[PDB]
């Protein structure tokens, strides 16, 4: 699946005359892409039960099984069928220096390591007060708290106080 | 989810108080008023209703949290909040 597109893309954007900052931006994202992926697998699955005592866990319904499996077998091959079938209608870059051609795999594997180490650091008994970076990232990056409250108040206050009245 | 009934609540309710080591099992009664007879400190009462909160999965408001006092009354407030009548 994602290899036939993302690995080609990360190689492609690296292999072009682009903004230097923009190119570095994708690599951090790909590493961060694995980061939250581990977070889901770690907290949700790899752990001990934390749900209410009455367990009603169930997936045996054929509707769920058929639907997921139908999409699952599609994801397994996916890009192999499409890439091999569509006519070659982009210019394929060939001579990549091996250090950057591995970047599509290096960053995500790197992001796997720290995210795994950071996630099981929760297993460690130590407790830390919130870092100001966490206070920023966890609140949707500070955007909704301001930009959905400041402009909305002004335009609304303008409508009633000024304008109409 | 099968309809959870009052017999199910009390069975789950006194299960946790029996679990709570300061409430030893033998003197558990459905109407065991905590500090008058179990000697359970009121500062731990605010700790057991959140134990109930995770037990049944919902929030008990603070207005009746300190009012939620008797194990029978624990069940009594559980039933109506989830319209448990059977």
């Amino acid at each position: 699946t994602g290899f036939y597109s993302k690995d080609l893309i990360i190689e492609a954007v690296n292999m072009s005359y682009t903004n230097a900052w923009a190119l570095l931006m994708t690599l951090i994202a790909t590493s961060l892409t694995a980061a939250y992926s581990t977070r889901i697998i770690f907290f949700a699955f790899l752990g001990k039960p934390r749900f209410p005592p009455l367990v009603l866990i169930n997936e045996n319904n054929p509707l769920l099984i058929n639907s997921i499996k139908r999409l699952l077998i599609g994801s397994i091959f996916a890009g192999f069928i499409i890439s091999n079938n569509i006519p070659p209608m982009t210019v394929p870059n060939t001579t990549m220096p091996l250090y950057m051609k591995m970047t599509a795999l290096i960053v995500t594997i790197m992001g796997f390591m720290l995210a795994l180490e950071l996630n099981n650091t929760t297993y460690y008994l130590k407790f830390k007060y919130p870092s100001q970076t966490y206070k920023f990232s966890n609140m949707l990056g500070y955007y909704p708290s301001i930009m959905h409250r400041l402009p909305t108040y002004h335009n609304l206050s303008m409508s009633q106080k000024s304008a109409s009245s | 989810a099968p309809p959870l009934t009052l017999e199910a609540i009390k069975d789950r309710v006194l299960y946790v108080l029996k679990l709570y080591d300061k409430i030893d099992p033998e003197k558990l009664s459905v109407n065991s008023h905590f500090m008058k007879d179990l000697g359970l400190d009121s500062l731990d009462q605010v700790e057991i209703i959140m134990a109930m909160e995770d037990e049944f999965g919902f929030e008990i408001p603070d207005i009746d949290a300190e009012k939620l006092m008797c194990p029978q009354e624990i069940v009594d407030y559980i039933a109506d909040k989830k319209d448990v009548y059977e």
Binding site: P53, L54, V55, L56, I57, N60, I65 | A1, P2, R12
Partner: peptide
Amino acid sequence: AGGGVHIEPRYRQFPQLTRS
């Protein structure tokens, strides 16, 4: 939620599974 559910729940136990 009627009787005859093959995924009959449990309390504080590992839920039953199936070979399928």
